[PDB]
């Protein structure tokens, strides 16, 4: 379809966690989502929250409708469960790597299904469990998913990082290696 | 070994072009789109056999059909006018870094929005096209993009390499110069 811009409400439900997600994207960037537990709208950028508002009830109402149609489609499909599509993992920095200058390592997990995932940052083999940001399970036009994980770090020559990814389509955990000299 | 899991997805897509809005509503079981409304068609259509009961029932409810036919004006146009005044005004200027890595000079252009960008390599004032290898546009997920444009080079003493970047956030092109050593 010819389009200058594409604005999409995307939502899904499933048996395993996360059981529901409701978000809106503009030109493939998540602009806001409805936190289903807090029952409130979360804006990706603060400027969006100052300019816009969205009734969180609209997202909860559509999630319930999605759960209704899920039960109906489970029975109609004769309990058809789709195959596991394993994820593609890439790790790269946000900024040019300068030793001593704060940076953000990005782990991008792509083309996977179902949206069930464990991701862990390893710094010199040790998990980083705090101060780590992550995106929603982001939709793709082929109805698989992708996702971003973020790690603040200071580059140094001796350090080694790993994005450890677990998915049902993988025989073993997937480890994408990265270091300051990685191209 | 795979636990029992069923997935249901829904999409509501508005396509803005030339002052018009085209609305698409998709109903998906796992990864299979089975029902769809397209404002260019005006009614629901079954994409697979799983959607025939839905499309048949929904097309029989004129209240449902009239609501979906009005979405391009009531929701798509409404949301687009808001995004025009804020989201489409977002301008983040690219940051440009040139550094050496056979022998490759790398123009790392970072943290820019929107995504449309022009990056050109110049050697002693002449634009180069051969040995230029650009990554695709890399989406960082935080409403910023980055791109890496590599140039294979044979550096003589006194060669002047320039990476030039053009972007709607810039009133004039940004140039970063790297003078060859060796």
């Amino acid at each position: 379809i010819k389009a200058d811009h594409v604005s999409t409400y995307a939502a899904f439900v499933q048996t395993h966690r996360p059981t529901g997600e409701f978000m809106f994207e503009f030109d493939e960037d998540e602009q806001f989502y409805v936190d289903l537990d807090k029952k409130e709208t979360v804006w990706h950028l603060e400027e969006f929250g100052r300019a816009f508002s969205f009734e969180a009830q609209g997202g909860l109402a559509n999630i319930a409708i999605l759960n209704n149609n899920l039960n109906t489609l489970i029975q109609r499909s004769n309990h058809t469960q789709a195959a596991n599509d394993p994820p593609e993992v890439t790790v790269f920095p946000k900024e040019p790597v300068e030793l001593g200058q704060p940076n953000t390592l990005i782990c991008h997990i792509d083309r996977f299904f179902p949206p069930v995932l464990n991701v862990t940052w390893l710094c010199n083999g040790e998990p980083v469990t705090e101060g780590v940001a992550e995106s929603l399970f982001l939709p793709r036009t082929d109805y698989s998913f992708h996702k971003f994980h973020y790690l603040t770090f200071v580059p140094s020559a001796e350090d080694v990082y790993d994005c450890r990814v677990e998915h049902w389509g993988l025989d073993q955990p997937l480890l994408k290696h990265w270091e300051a000299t990685s191209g | 070994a795979t636990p029992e899991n069923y997935v249901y997805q829904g999409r509501q897509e508005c396509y803005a072009f030339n002052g018009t809005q085209r609305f698409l509503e998709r109903y998906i079981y796992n990864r299979e789109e089975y029902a769809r409304f397209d404002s260019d068609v005006g009614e629901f259509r079954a994409v697979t056999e799983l959607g025939r009961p839905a499309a048949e029932y929904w097309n029989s409810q004129k209240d449902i059909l009239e609501e979906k036919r009005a979405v391009p004006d009531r929701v798509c146009r409404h949301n687009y006018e808001l995004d025009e005044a804020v989201t489409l005004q977002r301008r983040v200027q690219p940051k440009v870094n040139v550094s050496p890595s056979h022998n490759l000079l790398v123009c790392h252009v970072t943290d820019f929005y929107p995504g449309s960008i022009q990056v050109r390599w110049f050697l002693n004032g002449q634009e180069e096209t051969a040995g230029v290898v650009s990554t695709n546009l890399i989406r960082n997920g935080d409403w910023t993009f980055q791109i890496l444009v590599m140039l294979e080079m044979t550096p003589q003493q006194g060669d002047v390499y320039i990476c030039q970047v053009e972007h709607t956030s810039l009133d004039s092109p940004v140039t970063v110069e790297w003078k060859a050593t060796g």
Binding site: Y9, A11, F24, F32, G49, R50, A51, F52, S53, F54, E55, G58, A61, N62, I65, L66, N68, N69, T72 | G10, Q12, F23, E25, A35, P53, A54, Y57, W58, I64, E67, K68, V71, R74, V75, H78, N79, L82
Partner: peptide, 16 residues
């Protein structure tokens, strides 16, 4: 009470 229910499209608004 409907097997095949349609989702409803709602828009965002200017901030309060």
């Amino acid at each position: 009470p409907v097997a095949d229910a349609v989702i409803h499209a709602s828009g965002k608004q200017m901030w309060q």
